[PDB]
Amino acid sequence: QVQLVQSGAEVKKPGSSVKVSCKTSGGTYGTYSINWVRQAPGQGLEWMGAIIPIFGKTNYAQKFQGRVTITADASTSTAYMELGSLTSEDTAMYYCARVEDTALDHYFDYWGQGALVTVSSASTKGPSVFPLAPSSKSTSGGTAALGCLVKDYFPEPVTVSWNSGALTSGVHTFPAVLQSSGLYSLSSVVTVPSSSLGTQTYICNVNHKPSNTKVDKRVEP
Amino acid sequence: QSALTQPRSVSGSPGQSVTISCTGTSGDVGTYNYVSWYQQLPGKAPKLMIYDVTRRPSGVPDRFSGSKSGNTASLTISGLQADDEADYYCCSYAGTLTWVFGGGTKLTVLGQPKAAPSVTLFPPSSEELQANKATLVCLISDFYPGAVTVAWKADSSPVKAGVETTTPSKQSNNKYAASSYLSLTPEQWKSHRSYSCQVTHEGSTVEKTVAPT
């Protein structure tokens, strides 16, 4: 199937320039266009510009003309968007979207997963992970909530799995809070049978790609 | 050049019908029949719902229909379901290789059955206390409607410092969840007899309590 996969999240200093990629696979070489749309936190989608790589054609919205440059390599079906003189107004999620046929289609059918670009002078910081032990019992299974506290990381986002994917449902990862220090913190908890915790070993795996950090933490009574 | 005009929010009960407007100019909406509509769930990429003012892509339920009159297009949702709660954005072609988006509309489905919140209070890990910190973690889940108020207590007394609470977020079962954190030094945690997380939902106040014991 058609897949648009983007570069990861990144923190950039004010005045720097940022570059985001969008590789398309499964997508019928031809007159497709790659459009770049940004979304500030809690705001709406905003079209920035577009490229037709087969023709080398580019266009931009008036708000971003002169500051954004979109390039492409058809040989690897990859598009790039570079945005310069960054300020904190540019902190946003940046999506690539695709138009399959520029002559026939006038809408976006496929979207990338989005890359979050945070413009800040603060430094990247990996998270500290702590266990939230169940420490309680209800019945043979009854109720039991255990989890992991992912503390003091910057910037967003972090991903959390349980037992590297072996434990999948009844897991609940809460959205992060932004503390007064400018650092983020979240929690992720699983509800398992009370019998399990004598038997089974429970590990949470946190991935913070912006800092290239991975943390495994075992949750014991 | 400027964004298309959409209402900030629309609401309806399950089984009802709602409509979301999108007003542009003669140059984009009034000229082309290339209006598209995208749905965005919390924390995901947009999904195409009604390209070509009236057409549905395959897989999109027939409850979503599209309309246009003059400079204004409209997304109509019939038979509202809880799974429809999301941000909806309209988009219009505005000339060669040019598109303009609307500001977005938040769609919430009210009137679903009430659900009391599950509350779990976690004491500071002794690993964190070894690292000279203490964090009280109060997690609230499985409640509807999606709004609660959280208060913290030091043995009976309201504590308002070091408290950070998320906005409510939707779970995969169409219920809501949130979390609150109380930052304490190890000494403040050890010196008190107990700490309390009190969650209020639609007038009902429940609480959990942890102790240094």
Numbering used by the authors:
A (entry chain H): 1 to 52, 52A, 53 to 82, 82A, 82B, 82C, 83 to 100, 100A, ...
B (entry chain L): 1 to 9, 11 to 27, 27A, 27B, 27C, 28 to 95, 95A, 96 to 106, ...
What sentences appear in the manuscript?
Comparison of the RSB1 structures, unbound and in complex with DS-Cav1, revealed a root mean square deviation (rmsd) of 0.75 Å over 235 aligned Cα atoms, thus indicating little global conformational rearrangements are necessary to bind DS-Cav1. Despite the similarity in overall structural conformation, two side chain re-orientations do occur between the two states. The first is the RSB1 HCDR1 residue Tyr29, which is a key component of the cross protomer interactions and is notably shifted by ~ 4 Å relative to the bound state. The second change, LCDR2 residue Arg53, is also shifted by ~ 4 Å and repositions to form the salt bridge with Asp200 in the bound structure. Together, these minor local induced-fit events support a relevance for these interactions with DS-Cav1.
